[PDB]
Amino acid sequence: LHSFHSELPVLSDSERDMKKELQLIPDQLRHLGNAIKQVTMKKDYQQQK
């Protein structure tokens, strides 16, 4: 099924606009992947107290 979709000669309106959303998510993951660390370092500080 993955090979039967690879031979398509042009990008659609939906392939190009999913690509906009997928280009936005990494910087939200950069904030969430600091928020997890801030909550871990909160737990580390509370547990040691």
Binding site: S6, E7, L8, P9, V10, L11, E15, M18, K19, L22, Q23, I25, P26, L29, L32, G33, I36, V39, T40, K43
Partner: protein, 52 residues
């Protein structure tokens, strides 16, 4: 056996590999959270069954 790759297919693979890496990052960040939560429920459990 008989095709030349096109610029759309290059740009499609670069889009699906961005979704793969985002999915494989999110499913880690969801387990990082699950381990943090399991270590939050298990700290509350006193491991002596002699207590009345």
């Amino acid at each position: 056996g008989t095709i030349y790759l096109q610029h759309a297919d290059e740009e499609r693979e670069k889009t699906y590999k961005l979704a793969e890496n985002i999915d494989a990052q999110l499913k880690r960040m969801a387990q990082d959270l699950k381990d943090i939560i399991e270590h939050l429920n298990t700290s509350g459990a006193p491991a002596d069954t002699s207590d009345p």
